[PDB]
Design an enzyme around this catalytic site. Structure first.
Site, PDB file in Angstrom:
ATOM      1  N   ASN A 193      -7.869 -14.042   5.455  1.00  0.00           N
ATOM      2  CA  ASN A 193      -8.273 -14.385   4.160  1.00  0.00           C
ATOM      3  C   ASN A 193      -9.792 -14.366   4.012  1.00  0.00           C
ATOM      4  OD1 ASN A 193      -8.620 -15.368   1.692  1.00  0.00           O
ATOM      5  ND2 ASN A 193      -7.196 -17.097   1.924  1.00  0.00           N
TER       6      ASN A 193
ATOM      7  N   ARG B 148     -13.548 -16.016   8.019  1.00  0.00           N
ATOM      8  CA  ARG B 148     -14.739 -15.144   8.156  1.00  0.00           C
ATOM      9  C   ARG B 148     -15.452 -15.391   9.485  1.00  0.00           C
ATOM     10  NH1 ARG B 148     -15.202 -16.941   2.771  1.00  0.00           N
ATOM     11  NH2 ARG B 148     -16.851 -18.415   3.420  1.00  0.00           N
TER      12      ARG B 148
ATOM     13  N   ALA C 236     -11.523 -15.146   1.693  1.00  0.00           N
ATOM     14  CA  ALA C 236     -12.086 -16.238   0.921  1.00  0.00           C
ATOM     15  C   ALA C 236     -12.159 -17.522   1.737  1.00  0.00           C
ATOM     16  CB  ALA C 236     -11.258 -16.494  -0.320  1.00  0.00           C
ATOM     17  N   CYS C 237     -11.741 -17.502   2.989  1.00  0.00           N
ATOM     18  CA  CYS C 237     -11.688 -18.703   3.828  1.00  0.00           C
ATOM     19  C   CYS C 237     -12.814 -18.677   4.862  1.00  0.00           C
ATOM     20  CB  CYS C 237     -10.315 -18.803   4.507  1.00  0.00           C
ATOM     21  SG  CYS C 237     -10.247 -19.990   5.851  1.00  0.00           S
ATOM     22  N   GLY C 238     -13.693 -19.663   4.930  1.00  0.00           N
ATOM     23  CA  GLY C 238     -14.836 -19.697   5.817  1.00  0.00           C
ATOM     24  C   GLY C 238     -14.434 -19.577   7.279  1.00  0.00           C
TER      25      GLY C 238
END
Ligand SMILES: [Cs+]
Ligand SMILES: [Cs+]
Ligand SMILES: [Cs+]
Ligand SMILES: [Cs+]
Ligand SMILES: [Cs+]
Length: 138
Positions: free
Chosen positions: A7, A14, A9-11
């Protein structure tokens, strides 16, 4: 041969992806929200991760709330089928390497299953130091 269920959008997701890259390999990236694993694959991932099915559930998302999944009223296979039908319920990121599979929460769990050492220091996007240039975990 590395796979990340990612994902963007997930820190956590990343940071995990960049630590994989910092070990010198580019993983296969599966955008699980749009391309979830099949049931057999998900059953295998959970077995390999050595956690419970419920431990993989993502909270604070619409189906978790609306399906009432906080309550202890669901068998493991009921939960598995919810995850397949509503992939936002699959916590993230999951990483597979030749050494093993982990739910990489926190992201630095991925260091357990990366075969090759970090190539240099690694600092998370929020500034949290993870490994120094020497390779030591802080
Ligand atoms: Cs490599
Ligand atoms: Cs699939
Ligand atoms: Cs919705
Ligand atoms: Cs390792
Ligand atoms: Cs954070």
């Amino acid at each position: 041969n590395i796979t990340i269920y990612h994902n963007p959008a997930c820190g956590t997701s990343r940071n995990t992806l960049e630590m994989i890259r910092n070990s010198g390999t580019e993983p296969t990236i599966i955008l699980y929200l749009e391309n979830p694993p099949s049931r057999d694959e998900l059953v295998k991932l959970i077995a390999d991760m050595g956690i419970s099915v419920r431990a993989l559930l993502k909270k604070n998302v619409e189906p978790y709330e609306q399906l009432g999944l906080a309550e202890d009223k669901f068998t493991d296979d009921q939960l598995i089928d919810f995850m397949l039908q509503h992939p936002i319920l699959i916590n993230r990121p999951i990483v597979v390497t030749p050494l093993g599979t982990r739910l990489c929460r926190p992201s630095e769990v991925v260091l357990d299953i990366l075969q090759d050492a970090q190539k240099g220091a690694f600092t998370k996007e929020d500034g949290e130091k993870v490994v120094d240039e020497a390779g030591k975990r802080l």
